[PDB]
Amino acid sequence: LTADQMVSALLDAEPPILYSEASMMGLLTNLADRELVHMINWAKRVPGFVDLTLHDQVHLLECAWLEILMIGLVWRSMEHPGKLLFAPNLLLDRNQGMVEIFDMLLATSSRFRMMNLQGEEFVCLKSIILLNSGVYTLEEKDHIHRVLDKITDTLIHLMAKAGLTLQQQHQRLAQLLLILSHIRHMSNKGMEHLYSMKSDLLLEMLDAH
Amino acid sequence: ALSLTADQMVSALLDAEPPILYSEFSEASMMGLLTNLADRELVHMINWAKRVPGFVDLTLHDQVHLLECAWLEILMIGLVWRSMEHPGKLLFAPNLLLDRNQGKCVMVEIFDMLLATSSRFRMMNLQGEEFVCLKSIILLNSGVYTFDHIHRVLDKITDTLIHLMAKAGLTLQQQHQRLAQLLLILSHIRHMSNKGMEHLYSMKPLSDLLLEMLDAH
Amino acid sequence: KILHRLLQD
Amino acid sequence: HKILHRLLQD
Ligand SMILES: CC[C@@H](c1ccc(O)cc1)C(c1ccc(O)cc1)c1ccc(O)cc1
Ligand SMILES: CC[C@@H](c1ccc(O)cc1)C(c1ccc(O)cc1)c1ccc(O)cc1
């Protein structure tokens, strides 16, 4: 696939933004549980994912599901400063917060806003998270790394078409990927509280960690 | 710091490198050696951090925050680096080299992840000049989103990394591809640190310094 | 468990 | 206070 084709494939594969119906945690779990179903079908449409073995596809999803949920949350909350848009009907401020996770997500959202993160870049990062989060845990790894290299070329391709010099391209690429480290951090800490205070699908997701 | 060239940036980092320390078994002794080793390494890490270009520019409050958030990451990437030329084994110290089987004393999940990272560094043929760059990035990045200057220094190290890759004869495609591959590994290092930290707070005689690092988390 | 069912079809 | 605040300026 070309760089243009990579983006078009990812953009059209985007999951919908779902709505929501101890008080707060009931809603979020219900929301995440419905989102997980869409994430799975989204994962299949991510170029190169279904080429992997069924065993590997689940390991990747089991390790990255919360990261993918969180970066999605951070993304839709971009143009809503100081608040987290869990759903179009569920916009929460910091005060309504576990608040340590909220502050990190807000920081990431404000980080995306400062960087003017484009949707085309977002679907790349999200797909990168899916393929990367479980890869370090042989011919299949060569493939995953080949797809990752393809997504890297795609990211660079996007930045070059936006009039960025090759220095700014290389800087922005780094800036985007360094954020994935924070997203991993937020996920592990989120996972750490999720396992503390404990639907069907999400149980296999939580027990994986 | 931002005034430094790429060659000068590398030279500063290479020269600021901490030494490879030595150490003085069961689940009690083994955690004892590592704790003793890590506590001595931390003292050198603090002095290394001070010598990291752009680090002393930060507030003394921020310097503490970055080190408190990244200390285990920095310890781990160092370990991974020293274990690079020792496949299937972890070189904690020249006199302390452990296999995966000797990891199940206490920690076996952490060992395989680190081994995976080490073989990943070797398969990528990670250069020392690249290593000192990644390590400094970990220091400046891991706590920056949990507080403007830092992002500029980070950009400087990015320029520095590319410079190494460009001077090694890699095409502009392989440069940004290799750049991406290196930074994605930092996601796993962060993961290992988080998994390690919850395990450290589970078991915790730690020193004052190593204890104060843990409550930060 | 569940996951290898949903992704299989 | 914290140990770390001494090592970093001394
Ligand atoms: C940020 C809130 C996040 C969360 C995670 C872990 C925590 O400990 C607290 C909060 C939450 C969520 C994130 C993204 C998204 O699209 C929907 C919901 C969530 C996920 C799973 C779950 O079983 C319950 C809640
Ligand atoms: C990989 C072993 C790592 C570890 C961390 C947490 C675990 O639960 C088990 C193992 C270990 C270490 C890493 C790097 C290094 O240079 C020296 C030592 C360590 C650090 C601090 C500490 O109080 C005890 C042990």
Short mmCIF file of all heavy atoms in Angstrom, two decimals, chain B residues 173-202, unseen atoms left out:
data_model
loop_
_atom_site.label_atom_id
_atom_site.label_comp_id
_atom_site.label_asym_id
_atom_site.label_seq_id
_atom_site.Cartn_x
_atom_site.Cartn_y
_atom_site.Cartn_z
N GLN B 173 15.46 7.34 4.65
CA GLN B 173 14.38 6.44 5.02
C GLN B 173 14.78 5.58 6.22
O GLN B 173 14.06 5.53 7.22
CB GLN B 173 13.98 5.57 3.83
CG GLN B 173 12.68 4.82 4.03
CD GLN B 173 12.37 3.89 2.87
OE1 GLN B 173 13.27 3.39 2.20
NE2 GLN B 173 11.08 3.67 2.61
N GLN B 174 15.93 4.93 6.11
CA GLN B 174 16.44 4.10 7.20
C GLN B 174 16.72 4.93 8.45
O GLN B 174 16.66 4.42 9.56
CB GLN B 174 17.70 3.35 6.78
CG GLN B 174 17.47 2.25 5.75
CD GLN B 174 18.77 1.67 5.21
OE1 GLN B 174 19.81 2.32 5.26
NE2 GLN B 174 18.71 0.45 4.70
N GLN B 175 17.05 6.21 8.27
CA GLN B 175 17.30 7.09 9.40
C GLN B 175 16.05 7.27 10.26
O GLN B 175 16.09 7.05 11.47
CB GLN B 175 17.80 8.46 8.93
CG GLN B 175 19.24 8.46 8.44
CD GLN B 175 19.66 9.81 7.89
OE1 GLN B 175 19.25 10.86 8.39
NE2 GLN B 175 20.48 9.79 6.84
N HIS B 176 14.94 7.67 9.65
CA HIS B 176 13.72 7.89 10.42
C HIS B 176 13.07 6.56 10.81
O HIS B 176 12.39 6.48 11.83
CB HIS B 176 12.72 8.80 9.68
CG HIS B 176 12.23 8.27 8.37
ND1 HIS B 176 11.50 7.11 8.26
CD2 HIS B 176 12.31 8.77 7.12
CE1 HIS B 176 11.18 6.90 7.00
NE2 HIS B 176 11.66 7.90 6.28
N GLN B 177 13.31 5.52 10.02
CA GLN B 177 12.82 4.19 10.37
C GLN B 177 13.57 3.66 11.60
O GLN B 177 12.96 3.12 12.51
CB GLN B 177 12.97 3.21 9.20
CG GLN B 177 11.95 3.42 8.09
CD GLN B 177 12.01 2.33 7.03
OE1 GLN B 177 12.93 1.52 7.01
NE2 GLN B 177 11.01 2.31 6.15
N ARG B 178 14.89 3.82 11.61
CA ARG B 178 15.69 3.39 12.76
C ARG B 178 15.37 4.24 13.99
O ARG B 178 15.28 3.73 15.10
CB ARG B 178 17.18 3.46 12.45
CG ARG B 178 18.06 3.02 13.61
CD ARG B 178 19.52 2.91 13.20
NE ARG B 178 20.37 2.54 14.32
CZ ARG B 178 20.54 1.29 14.75
NH1 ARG B 178 19.92 0.29 14.15
NH2 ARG B 178 21.33 1.05 15.78
N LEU B 179 15.20 5.54 13.76
CA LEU B 179 14.82 6.47 14.83
C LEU B 179 13.54 6.01 15.50
O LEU B 179 13.45 5.96 16.73
CB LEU B 179 14.65 7.89 14.28
CG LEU B 179 14.16 8.94 15.29
CD1 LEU B 179 15.20 9.17 16.38
CD2 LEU B 179 13.80 10.25 14.59
N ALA B 180 12.54 5.69 14.69
CA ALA B 180 11.25 5.21 15.18
C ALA B 180 11.40 3.91 15.97
O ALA B 180 10.84 3.78 17.06
CB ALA B 180 10.29 5.01 14.02
N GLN B 181 12.14 2.96 15.42
CA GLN B 181 12.36 1.67 16.07
C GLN B 181 13.00 1.81 17.45
O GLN B 181 12.62 1.11 18.38
CB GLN B 181 13.23 0.77 15.18
CG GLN B 181 12.52 0.27 13.93
CD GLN B 181 13.47 -0.36 12.93
OE1 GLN B 181 14.68 -0.42 13.16
NE2 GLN B 181 12.93 -0.85 11.82
N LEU B 182 13.96 2.72 17.58
CA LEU B 182 14.64 2.94 18.85
C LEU B 182 13.71 3.50 19.91
O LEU B 182 13.73 3.07 21.06
CB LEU B 182 15.84 3.87 18.68
CG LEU B 182 17.06 3.32 17.95
CD1 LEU B 182 18.18 4.35 17.93
CD2 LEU B 182 17.53 2.03 18.60
N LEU B 183 12.88 4.47 19.53
CA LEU B 183 12.02 5.16 20.48
C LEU B 183 10.83 4.32 20.92
O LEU B 183 10.32 4.48 22.02
CB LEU B 183 11.53 6.48 19.89
CG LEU B 183 12.63 7.47 19.53
CD1 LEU B 183 12.04 8.68 18.84
CD2 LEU B 183 13.41 7.88 20.77
N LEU B 184 10.39 3.41 20.05
CA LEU B 184 9.30 2.51 20.39
C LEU B 184 9.73 1.52 21.46
O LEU B 184 8.90 1.01 22.22
CB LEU B 184 8.81 1.76 19.15
CG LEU B 184 7.99 2.60 18.16
CD1 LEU B 184 7.48 1.73 17.03
CD2 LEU B 184 6.85 3.31 18.87
N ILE B 185 11.03 1.26 21.53
CA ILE B 185 11.58 0.36 22.54
C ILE B 185 11.45 0.99 23.92
O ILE B 185 11.28 0.30 24.92
CB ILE B 185 13.05 0.01 22.24
CG1 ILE B 185 13.16 -0.74 20.90
CG2 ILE B 185 13.65 -0.84 23.35
CD1 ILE B 185 14.58 -1.01 20.47
N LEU B 186 11.51 2.32 23.96
CA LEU B 186 11.33 3.06 25.21
C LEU B 186 9.95 2.83 25.82
O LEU B 186 9.76 3.02 27.03
CB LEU B 186 11.55 4.56 24.98
CG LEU B 186 12.91 4.99 24.44
CD1 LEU B 186 13.05 6.50 24.50
CD2 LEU B 186 14.04 4.31 25.21
N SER B 187 9.00 2.42 25.00
CA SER B 187 7.67 2.08 25.49
C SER B 187 7.74 0.81 26.32
O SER B 187 7.09 0.70 27.37
CB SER B 187 6.68 1.90 24.33
OG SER B 187 6.12 3.13 23.94
N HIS B 188 8.54 -0.15 25.86
CA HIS B 188 8.71 -1.41 26.57
C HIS B 188 9.52 -1.22 27.84
O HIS B 188 9.23 -1.84 28.87
CB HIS B 188 9.38 -2.44 25.66
CG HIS B 188 9.41 -3.83 26.23
ND1 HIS B 188 10.57 -4.54 26.39
CD2 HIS B 188 8.41 -4.63 26.67
CE1 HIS B 188 10.29 -5.73 26.91
NE2 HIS B 188 8.99 -5.80 27.09
N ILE B 189 10.52 -0.35 27.78
CA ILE B 189 11.34 -0.04 28.94
C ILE B 189 10.48 0.59 30.03
O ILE B 189 10.62 0.27 31.22
CB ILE B 189 12.51 0.89 28.58
CG1 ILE B 189 13.49 0.17 27.65
CG2 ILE B 189 13.24 1.36 29.83
CD1 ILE B 189 14.58 1.06 27.11
N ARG B 190 9.58 1.47 29.63
CA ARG B 190 8.63 2.07 30.56
C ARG B 190 7.76 0.99 31.19
O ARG B 190 7.50 1.01 32.39
CB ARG B 190 7.77 3.12 29.84
CG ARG B 190 6.85 3.91 30.76
CD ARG B 190 7.65 4.93 31.56
NE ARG B 190 6.91 6.17 31.76
CZ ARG B 190 7.03 7.24 30.98
NH1 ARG B 190 7.85 7.22 29.94
NH2 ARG B 190 6.32 8.33 31.24
N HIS B 191 7.31 0.06 30.35
CA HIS B 191 6.48 -1.06 30.80
C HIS B 191 7.20 -1.91 31.85
O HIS B 191 6.65 -2.21 32.90
CB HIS B 191 6.08 -1.93 29.61
CG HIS B 191 5.13 -3.03 29.95
ND1 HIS B 191 3.82 -2.80 30.31
CD2 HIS B 191 5.29 -4.38 29.98
CE1 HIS B 191 3.22 -3.95 30.55
NE2 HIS B 191 4.09 -4.92 30.36
N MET B 192 8.44 -2.28 31.54
CA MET B 192 9.25 -3.09 32.45
C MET B 192 9.46 -2.38 33.78
O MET B 192 9.46 -3.01 34.84
CB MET B 192 10.60 -3.41 31.81
CG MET B 192 10.51 -4.34 30.61
SD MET B 192 12.13 -4.85 30.00
CE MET B 192 12.81 -3.29 29.45
N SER B 193 9.64 -1.06 33.72
CA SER B 193 9.84 -0.25 34.92
C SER B 193 8.59 -0.27 35.80
O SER B 193 8.69 -0.39 37.02
CB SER B 193 10.19 1.18 34.54
OG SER B 193 10.19 2.02 35.68
N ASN B 194 7.43 -0.13 35.17
CA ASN B 194 6.17 -0.14 35.90
C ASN B 194 5.92 -1.49 36.55
O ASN B 194 5.48 -1.56 37.70
CB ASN B 194 5.01 0.21 34.96
CG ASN B 194 5.03 1.65 34.52
OD1 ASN B 194 5.59 2.51 35.20
ND2 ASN B 194 4.40 1.94 33.38
N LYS B 195 6.22 -2.55 35.82
CA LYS B 195 6.08 -3.91 36.33
C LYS B 195 7.09 -4.19 37.43
O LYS B 195 6.79 -4.90 38.39
CB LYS B 195 6.22 -4.93 35.19
CG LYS B 195 5.05 -4.93 34.23
CD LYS B 195 3.75 -5.06 35.00
CE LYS B 195 2.53 -5.19 34.11
NZ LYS B 195 1.32 -5.39 34.95
N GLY B 196 8.29 -3.64 37.29
CA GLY B 196 9.32 -3.77 38.30
C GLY B 196 9.02 -3.02 39.58
O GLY B 196 9.23 -3.53 40.68
N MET B 197 8.52 -1.79 39.43
CA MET B 197 8.20 -0.93 40.57
C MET B 197 7.10 -1.45 41.49
O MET B 197 7.16 -1.27 42.71
CB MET B 197 7.79 0.45 40.05
CG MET B 197 8.00 1.58 41.04
SD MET B 197 9.71 2.12 41.04
CE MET B 197 9.87 2.72 39.36
N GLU B 198 6.09 -2.10 40.92
CA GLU B 198 4.99 -2.63 41.72
C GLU B 198 5.51 -3.83 42.51
O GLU B 198 5.03 -4.14 43.60
CB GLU B 198 3.80 -3.03 40.84
CG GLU B 198 4.08 -4.17 39.89
CD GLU B 198 2.93 -4.49 38.96
OE1 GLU B 198 1.79 -4.04 39.22
OE2 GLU B 198 3.17 -5.23 37.98
N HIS B 199 6.50 -4.50 41.93
CA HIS B 199 7.15 -5.64 42.56
C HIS B 199 8.11 -5.23 43.67
O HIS B 199 8.30 -5.96 44.65
CB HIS B 199 7.88 -6.41 41.47
CG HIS B 199 7.02 -7.40 40.77
ND1 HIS B 199 6.94 -7.48 39.40
CD2 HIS B 199 6.24 -8.41 41.25
CE1 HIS B 199 6.10 -8.44 39.06
NE2 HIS B 199 5.68 -9.03 40.16
N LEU B 200 8.72 -4.06 43.51
CA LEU B 200 9.62 -3.52 44.52
C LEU B 200 8.85 -3.04 45.75
O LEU B 200 9.30 -3.21 46.88
CB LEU B 200 10.46 -2.39 43.94
CG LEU B 200 11.69 -2.88 43.16
CD1 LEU B 200 12.68 -1.75 42.98
CD2 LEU B 200 12.33 -4.07 43.86
N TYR B 201 7.68 -2.44 45.53
CA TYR B 201 6.85 -1.95 46.62
C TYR B 201 6.12 -3.10 47.32
O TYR B 201 5.56 -2.93 48.40
CB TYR B 201 5.84 -0.92 46.12
N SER B 202 6.13 -4.26 46.68
CA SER B 202 5.53 -5.46 47.23
C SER B 202 6.43 -6.03 48.32
O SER B 202 5.96 -6.43 49.39
CB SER B 202 5.29 -6.50 46.13
OG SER B 202 4.80 -7.71 46.68
#
